[PDB]
């Protein structure tokens, strides 16, 4: 039965990001006074399909210059680990009930970091290396941020499983103690996941399709559905952590409801973000996230660790 | 440099072997092994330049990995005993190991190679601080299990250090290099007796250090670094000539002076356990020792050589560079022969 | 808000190690004779 | 058993994909499209050359922040202790320490980058 | 200095949250007084079994049974 | 050398419970108010004595206490106490909040009929005082005798005989 | 060590957590704590070289408990011997080795 | 397997001579690989072929050392028969070294190493004799 | 599912052989990211959580620098991967053909002491505690706060002093 | 255990074999540094949980600490090196024997 749980987690997640992918298009469009895609569906909802298909009929490229091991595996690296990251996630009831959920986490997003990284190398072009570059820049600027705001966050929680949260908010969400931390963290996110402002390795018109200018066909599709996965993974991390919904022992499917609201929301404030804004510069990036984030994050992790004790409220281990 | 850095490093480095000390834990010995090796680099590179870039590459890269092997001897005793100490009955294969890692770490023949090349790389200060404060900690691990130590290859890497010291000193132009050579058959002396009675071992490495700081002292006074600018002393600073003659005959064992007390009583406590001809091979190839010392006064003191025409600013000016503590440390060596029972 | 649900926290795992703390001796004393079985069980089958 | 099956599901479903966009189409393989894009024109060098990087100090220091990460990261568990003041003062310090490095790097200008 | 503040509070006011919150965290510890609770509770926690003793005839301070007067009683937990 | 003396398996044959770990909860708080005794007086067999061999007779008895137990249990207070573990089963780690109507009623039921009240919060979480006819373990672990250390030399030291020794030196 | 300072000043910087049988974090003995504690306990007062002859059934069964081969060897002995009382036809086992019990609780 | 150079000493010199010949030629071959590694490491060739020629240069240079040095030996044991007697392995190592001058083309390296050897294996004969221990253990 | 440790011990010494062959920083960096990720599941096997985590988390951070500078400094135009020396490729299988021959022959020379083949996946826990709590690994590396704060401050200090040691190499 | 301890060790003589046989680069070396880390941290960590000797396991995370500085100092002497002579390969450290 374990094989049908994994289906009912898997395909309704690539259905769900390539529908992102409409839900992208047109707010970018009724933000930009136009209309998305409305012709190939009654509302454009075959226009993911038709993309798809596109694409996995195009014939690929294994250019001359490159390392093909790590032009084919590097993809399939991407979409395993935007795969297997959403296993853990409590919904409320989660799949695989990890001990050590959080850095579960933080280990395959660093190594989903390694697709880009070797995707960039193996296409041995200028642009590929400018991404290359530059992802190793992001990753060195978030990191750091990610990780301590985390632990600043479970220190109020006792524990790094994601069950645990669930009874942490039991009664309030966790944006009200921790809403700067909210802040970083939806802000790290953005970084992660190579997302506007912090685009910066597709930098259109910088590096033209930087990590990806040699990629055509499924490839591309593969890298593309990947970034559209994490993202729906990170509002729904946001939305476990900080935006506790109701769990009702009795009713789960009422968690279950009101996570999809609260990703939605948040995953609608992402496109909201790109539409609005422009791009960073890379360096303004690690000089941002170092000397106005990292400063803040140390103190308010002084603050968290501070404030079990003097309040007499450290949580409990299980 | 700024002060709040040399202050970090400084105390880094005088924490790494106090550490090693004050430490039964076998891991933070190594921690402070590798506070030593990570503080001393800033310093050995601090003229940027490719001679101090490859001697500090040379010095990390030949540390790194004796540090490793002695992290997997630890390892192993710990996988043994369940215990972060060696004791007894442990493996003589994981104390051979550490002994071979210490000996890389010191500078012990046939391990050697390195040493001349990153002395010579660097300046006079931090080959002081790299012969004398760096083999310090190196010959705690050693003293604190010299019973549990093979008595053979411990001889062959002292006698092989000897002779490898002796045949290199020899022939080099360069001082920052005799003083290498001299240190290599120096520690060989020591690692000799180590498994006999350690207290000598400590004895000469008190000697040596108290020889061998005022010498690059001497070198430092007028940034010497080859024979042909030490020989131009008699003109620079020719009260020198005193303590360098009687300092370098006592590197070189010669009676009345104190240097010649550490090979006599270790020859002493080697025939008192039969080690006869080993001891004896010693003695023989320290007169090779001797050798360069005996040619290197010749060259500045007793046949002095041509100066130049601008050395004579040199007699104008003034100087300030001897600390007060060159006096001492040149006239407790030398001249404490008599004292040595309250040495020993 | 946090420190009162915290607090309260800390009062239930009380409770709940308090039940283990009243059932330690049972599961001690089954498995114990469960694990002597079993070393009885070996030995016999090594005899023959 | 289930994490092991998540994992091989996932890598299986990546192959058969690439599988399938590799050996459906129809090719048309010639040097013209195989070699590198470089925007229109020719590559005039290789990319496999030495790329000055300008942010390698910040490379180093997220190495030494990424190990204090993992010092301080067992502080869940480090709470439930009695004491509650060594460890209290100990990541004070720590994190006061980390920190005053990192102001000392911002001064000395190696969060700068080599212009 | 007053109006070093006042400026450091408009251009860059993110490092001076810093070591306000910095300093906040180290006093407030001192000052409250439901600091010394937190060990107290650390050490209530029964992770591992409770070993009874024995009996030597002149043990008056310690209970023959859970529920007695006598022991370390948890009541400042409760209704804290 | 020496074999290792192991019981029968009738040394090892109890009228064992049969019962699973929520129903096995939910009674817990009154299995440590009842029946405390002969856990306590077990506890201190298993670890005065670090041998299970020794303390088989008092775990026998401690699994009666337990059946004696769940039979009272059984005659009155039955299908209450039913409703509460069937309730506590459904959760995940087995906790109590989520039952805590049931709670009462199952000590409405035992307080009014056979009269026990539940301990407060952490009475079962303190060292207990138990008394027993057995003897203490003379040296558990089995300690051979230890060797005697070498002697101390006894004496109000004196001036070296001819001073040092060394070569020549006089004094 | 070389300097004993902690001794000097009574500190334990690092003196407290050397062998398995000390002062785990919440009290779960270490295993082989008893033969590491009766060894250490052998091993006081002499030094050394004594120490490495009368005590050393001390040290022998702590090596046994530790690094566990005698125990190793007599299973392997016991395996042997039956897979080839199996393949000679001689032995079947029981059912509580086949997978086929009454669980005891 | 440090038994079959042990078995050197199992029967006097003059006895077995062609057993304890080629325990010396192994004892030789294995010094001359020893130093051909010191001298390919350090000192390396313009290419393997010269590398290999150096290695066994070297090793069978140190051979005909040690044959010639255990003919010699039980030879003028056999000879003059006087076991207990350092001046055989005082005329086997100046064979020894008269080869050395022959493989290196020099009469200088020939009468040097002939004394050297010579006294060498002479004071080795004393100490087997008189039982002098190398590498001693800490007795005190 | 026995022979799971071996087999993740074997592709960690397959990993350090293709590091040790010294091919790009690119594919040695993959071969350091294979092998961490396999010790990470190695200590899971025995029952260690954290500890692997941190090993793979901090390895990725590491090996990330890695790439950023072997991209700068340590890279060619043709980078010599591990094929493309015949010697390399002939090394690589000559060790894993003498990984497999001396594995046979250690399973020969001695019954059971060095390589246990025939017995496998019998020894790996070594005396579980069936009944604990606040028992897994975070708990000791929880003691740097309390019970170890001497590890927690020369740590510390090694990081704090790594910073100016970097920025004075780099000056 | 002891097969797996077996392997660990035989991969840090691996990884010893190479940080000691050169080649033309320098971070290769620097990996092979790293590789015996790794390796030894499993084995204190494998031998840490075998023997339920919590108190030791502070020691692993000092390993890594310790190493990862060793790895930081290694790589700015290596932003030295190319800074000087431009292509990172070790046969260009060959002036000091004069
Ligand atoms: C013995 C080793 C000697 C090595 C050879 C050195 C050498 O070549 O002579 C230098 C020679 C160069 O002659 P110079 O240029 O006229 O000398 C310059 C003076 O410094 C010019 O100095 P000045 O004229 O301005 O002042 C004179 C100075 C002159 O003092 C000196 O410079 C030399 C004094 C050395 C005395 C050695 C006595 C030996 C005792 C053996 C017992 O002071 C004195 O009056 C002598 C005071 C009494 C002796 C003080 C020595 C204290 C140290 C004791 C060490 C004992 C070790 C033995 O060549
Ligand atoms: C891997 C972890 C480390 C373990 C040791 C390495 C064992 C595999 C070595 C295989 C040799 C690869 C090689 O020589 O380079 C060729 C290639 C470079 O290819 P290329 O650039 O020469 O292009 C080849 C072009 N065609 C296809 C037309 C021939 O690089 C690699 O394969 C190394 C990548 C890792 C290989 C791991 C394969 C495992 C299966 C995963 C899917
Ligand atoms: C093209 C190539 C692409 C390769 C893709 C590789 C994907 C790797 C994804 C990153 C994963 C890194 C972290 C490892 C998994 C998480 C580890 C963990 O902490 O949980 C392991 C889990 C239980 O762990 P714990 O919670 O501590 O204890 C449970 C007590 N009830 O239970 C376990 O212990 C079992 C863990 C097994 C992990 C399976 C790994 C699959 C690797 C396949 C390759
Ligand atoms: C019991 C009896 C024992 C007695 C022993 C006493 C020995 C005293 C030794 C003193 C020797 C000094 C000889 C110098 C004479 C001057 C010769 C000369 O004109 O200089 C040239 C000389 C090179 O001459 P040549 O050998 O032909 O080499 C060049 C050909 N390519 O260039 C030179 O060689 C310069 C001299 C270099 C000296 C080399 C090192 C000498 C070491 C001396 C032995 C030390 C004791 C060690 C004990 C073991
Ligand atoms: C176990 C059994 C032990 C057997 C011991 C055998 C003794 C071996 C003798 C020492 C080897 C010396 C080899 C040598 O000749 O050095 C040559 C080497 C440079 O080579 P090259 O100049 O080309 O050759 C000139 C011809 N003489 O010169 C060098 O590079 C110096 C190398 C010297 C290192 C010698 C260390 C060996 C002793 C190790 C002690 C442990
Ligand atoms: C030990 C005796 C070594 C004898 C030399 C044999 C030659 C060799 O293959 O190793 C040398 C090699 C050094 O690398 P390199 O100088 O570049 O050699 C030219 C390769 N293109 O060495 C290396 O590059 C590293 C080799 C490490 C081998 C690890 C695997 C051992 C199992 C086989």
């Known amino acids: 039965m374990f094989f049908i749980n994994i289906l009912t987690l898997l395909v309704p997640i690539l259905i769900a990001m390539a529908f992102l992918t409409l839900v992208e298009r047109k707010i970018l469009g009724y933000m930009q006074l136009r209309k998305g895609p409305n012709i190939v569906g009654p509302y454009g909802i075959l226009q993911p399909f038709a993309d798809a298909m596109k694409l996995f009929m195009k014939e690929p490229m294994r250019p001359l210059t490159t390392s093909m091991s790590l032009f084919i595996i590097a993809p399939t690296l991407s979409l395993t680990l935007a795969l297997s990251l959403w296993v853990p996630l409590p919904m409320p009831h989660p799949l695989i009930n990890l001990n050590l959920g959080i850095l579960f986490i933080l280990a395959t997003s660093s190594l989903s970091v390694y697709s880009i990284l070797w995707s960039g190398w193996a296409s041995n072009s200028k642009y590929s290396l400018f991404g290359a570059l530059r992802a190793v820049a992001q990753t060195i600027s978030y990191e750091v941020t990610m990780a301590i705001i985390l632990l600043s966050v479970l220190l109020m929680n ?161 | 440099m700024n002060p709040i850095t ?113 002395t010579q790389g660097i300046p006079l200060h931090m080959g002081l601080i790299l012969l004398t404060w760096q083999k310090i900690a190196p010959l705690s691990i050693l003293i604190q299990i010299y019973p549990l130590l093979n008595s053979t ?124 001809i080993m001891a004896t091979l010693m003695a023989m190839m320290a007169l090779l020792n001797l050798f360069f010392y005996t040619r290197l006064i010749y060259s500045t003191s007793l046949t002095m050589f041509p100066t ?32 040595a029972p309250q040495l020993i | 808000r946090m420190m009162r649900w915290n607090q309260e926290r800390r009062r239930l795992l009380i409770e709940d190690l308090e039940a283990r703390i009243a059932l330690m001796p049972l599961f001690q004393a089954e498995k114990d004779r469960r694990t002597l079985q079993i070393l009885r069980e070996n030995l016999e089958e090594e005899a023959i | 058993m289930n994490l092991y099956t998540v994992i091989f599901i996932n890598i299986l479903l990546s192959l058969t994909l690439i599988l399938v966009a590799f050996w459906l189409p129809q090719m048309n393989l010639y040097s013209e499209k195989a070699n590198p894009y470089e925007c229109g024109f020719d590559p005039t060098s290789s990319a496999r050359l030495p790329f000055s990087m300008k942010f390698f100090l910040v490379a180093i220091t997220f190495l030494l922040f990424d190990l204090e990460i993992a010092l301080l990261l067992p502080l869940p568990w480090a709470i439930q202790t009695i004491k509650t003041s060594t460890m209290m003062i100990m990541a004070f310090i720590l994190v006061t320490i980390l920190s005053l490095g990192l102001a000392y790097e911002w001064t000395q200008k190696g969060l700068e980058w080599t212009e | ?66 529920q007695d007067p006598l022991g370390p009683s948890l009541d400042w937990l409760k209704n804290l | 050398p020496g074999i290792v003396e192991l019981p029968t398996l009738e040394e090892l044959k109890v009228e064992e419970v049969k019962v699973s770990s929520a129903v096995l909860k939910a009674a817990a708080h009154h299995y440590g108010a009842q029946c405390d005794k002969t856990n306590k007086e077990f506890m201190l067999c298993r670890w005065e004595e670090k041998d299970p061999r020794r303390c088989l007779k008092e775990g026998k008895l401690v699994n009666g206490c337990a059946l004696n137990f769940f039979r009272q249990i059984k005659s009155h207070c039955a299908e209450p106490f039913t409703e509460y573990w069937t309730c506590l089963d459904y959760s995940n780690m087995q906790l109590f909040r989520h039952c805590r109507q049931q709670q009462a009623k199952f000590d409405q039921c035992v307080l009014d009929k056979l009269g026990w009240v539940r301990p407060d919060l952490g009475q079962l979480s303190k060292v207990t005082k138990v008394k027993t006819d057995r003897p203490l373990p003379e040296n558990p672990y089995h300690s051979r005798a230890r060797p005697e250390p070498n002697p101390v030399i006894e004496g109000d030291l004196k001036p070296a005989k001819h001073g040092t020794r060394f070569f020549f030196w006089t004094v | 060590p070389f300097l004993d300072i902690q001794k000097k000043l009574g500190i334990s910087l690092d003196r407290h957590f050397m062998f398995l049988s000390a002062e785990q974090p919440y009290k779960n003995a270490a295993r082989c704590h008893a033969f590491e504690k009766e060894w250490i306990e052998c091993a006081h007062g002499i030094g050394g070289t004594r120490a490495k002859k009368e005590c050393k059934i001390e040290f022998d069964d702590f090596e046994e408990c530790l690094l566990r081969y005698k125990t190793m060897r007599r299973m392997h002995d016991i395996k042997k011997q039956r897979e080839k009382l199996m393949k000679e036809g001689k032995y079947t086992p029981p059912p509580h080795h086949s997978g086929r019990e009454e669980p005891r609780p | 397997v440090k038994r079959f150079f042990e078995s050197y000493h199992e029967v006097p010199d003059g006895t077995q001579c062609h057993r304890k010949t080629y325990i010396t030629t192994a004892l030789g071959g294995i010094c001359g690989i020893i130093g051909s590694a010191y001298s390919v490491s350090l000192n390396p060739a313009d290419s393997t072929l010269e590398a290999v020629a150096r290695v066994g240069r070297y090793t069978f240079t140190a051979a ?77 | ?85 015949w010697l390399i490729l002939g090394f690589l299988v000559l060790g894993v053909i003498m990984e497999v021959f001396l594995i046979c022959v250690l399973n020969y020379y001695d019954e059971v002491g060095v390589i246990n083949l025939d017995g496998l996946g019998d020894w790996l826990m070594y005396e579980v505690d069936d009944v604990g709590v606040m028992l897994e690994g975070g708990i000791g590396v929880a003691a740097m706060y309390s019970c170890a704060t001497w590890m927690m401050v020369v740590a510390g200090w090694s990081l704090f002093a790594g910073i100016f040691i970097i920025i004075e190499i780099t000056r | 255990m002891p097969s797996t301890f077996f392997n660990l060790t035989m991969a840090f003589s691996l990884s010893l074999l190479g940080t000691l046989m050169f080649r033309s680069h320098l971070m290769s070396t620097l990996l092979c540094l ?65």
């Open chain 2, 6 to 118: 040399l202050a970090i490093i400084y105390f880094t480095i005088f924490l790494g072997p106090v550490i090693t000390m004050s430490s039964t834990n076998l891991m933070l010995m190594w921690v402070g092994l590798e506070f030593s090796l990570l503080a001393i680099i800033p310093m050995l590179i601090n003229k940027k330049n490719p001679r101090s870039t490859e001697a500090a590459t040379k010095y990390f890269v030949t540390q790194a990995t004796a540090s490793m092997i002695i992290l997997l001897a630890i390892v192993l005793n710990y996988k043994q005993l369940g215990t972060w100490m060696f004791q007894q009955q442990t493996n003589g294969l994981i104390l051979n190991m550490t002994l071979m890692a210490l000996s890389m770490k010191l500078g012990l023949a046939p391990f050697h190679f390195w040493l001349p090349e990153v």
């Open chain 9, 1 to 85: 599912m026995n022979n799971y440790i071996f087999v993740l011990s074997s592709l960690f010494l397959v990993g350090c052989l293709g590091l040790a062959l010294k091919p790009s920083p690119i594919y040695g960096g993959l071969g350091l990211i294979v092998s961490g990720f396999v010790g990470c599941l190695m200590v899971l096997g025995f029952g260690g959580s954290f500890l692997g985590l941190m090993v793979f988390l901090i390895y990725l951070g590491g090996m990330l620098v890695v790439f950023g500078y072997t991209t700068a400094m340590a890279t060619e135009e043709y980078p010599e991967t591990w094929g493309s020396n």
């Open chain 2, 308 to 339: 130049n025409n601008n050395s004579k600013m040199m007699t104008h000016q003034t100087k300030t560079k001897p600390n007060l503590m060159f006096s001492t440390l040149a006239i407790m060596s030398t001249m404490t022969l008599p004292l």
């Open chain 1, 158 to 318: 006792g524990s790094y499983s994601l069950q645990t949260l669930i009874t942490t908010q039991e009664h309030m969400w966790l944006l009200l103690p921790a809403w700067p931390m909210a802040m970083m963290w939806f802000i790290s996110t953005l970084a992660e996941t190579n997302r506007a402002p912090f685009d910066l390795t597709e930098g259109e018109s910088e590096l033209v399709s930087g990590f990806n200018v040699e990629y055509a066909a499924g490839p591309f599709a593969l890298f593309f559905m990947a970034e559209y996965t994490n993202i729906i993974l990170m509002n729904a991390l946001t939305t476990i952590i900080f935006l506790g919904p109701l769990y009702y022992i009795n009713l789960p499917e009422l968690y279950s409801t009101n996570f999809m609201m609260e990703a939605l929301l948040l995953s609608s404030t992402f496109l909201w973000i790109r539409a609005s804004y422009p791009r960073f510069r890379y360096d303004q990036l690690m000089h941002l996230l170092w000397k106005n984030f990292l400063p803040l994050t140390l103190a308010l992790c002084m603050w968290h660790i501070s404030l079990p004790i003097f309040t007499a409220g450290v949580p409990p281990y299980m």
């Open chain 2, 153 to 276: 290859i411990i001889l062959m890497l002292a006698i092989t250090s000897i002779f490898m010291g002796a045949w290199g000193g020899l022939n080099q132009t360069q001082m920052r290099k005799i003083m290498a050579y001299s240190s290599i058959a120096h520690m060989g002396w020591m690692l000799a007796i180590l498994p006999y009675n350690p207290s000598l071992t400590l004895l000469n490495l008190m000697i040596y250090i108290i020889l061998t700081a005022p010498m690059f002292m001497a070198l430092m006074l007028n940034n010497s670094m080859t024979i042909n600018s030490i020989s131009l002393l008699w003109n620079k600073t020719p009260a020198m000539l005193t303590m360098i003659s009687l300092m370098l005959l006592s590197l070189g064992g010669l009676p009345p002076l104190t240097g010649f007390l550490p090979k006599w009583i270790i020859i002493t406590e080697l025939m008192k356990n039969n080690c006869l």
């Open chain 8, 64 to 140: 005909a050392i040690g044959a010639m040095f255990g003919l010699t030996t039980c030879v003028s044991a056999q000879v003059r028969e006087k076991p207990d007697d350092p001046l055989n392995y005082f005329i086997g190592g100046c064979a020894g070294g008269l080869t050395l001058g022959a493989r290196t083309h020099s009469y200088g390296t020939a009468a040097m190493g002939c004394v050297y050897m010579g006294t060498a294996a002479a004071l080795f004969k004393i100490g087997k004799l008189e039982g002098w221990e190398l590498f001693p253990t800490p007795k005190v």
């Open chain 10, 34 to 98: 790293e590789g015996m880390v790794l390796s030894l941290f499993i084995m204190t960590s494998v031998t840490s949980l075998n023997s339920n000797s919590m108190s030791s396991m502070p020691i692993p995370i000092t390993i890594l600490v310790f190493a990862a500085c060793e790895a930081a100092v290694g790589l700015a002497l290596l932003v030295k090196v190319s800074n000087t002579y431009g292509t990172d390969y070790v046969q260009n450290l060959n002036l000091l024997q004069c």
């Open chain 5, 1 to 66: 200095i007053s109006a070093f503040l006042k400026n450091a509070w408009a251009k860059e006011p993110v490092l001076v949250v810093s070591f306000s919150v910095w300093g906040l965290a180290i006093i407030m510890p001192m000052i409250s007084p439901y600091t010394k609770y937190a060990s107290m509770i650390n050490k209530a926690t029964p992770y591992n079994y409770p070993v009874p003793v024995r009996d030597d005839g002149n043990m008056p301070d310690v209970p023959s049974h859970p």
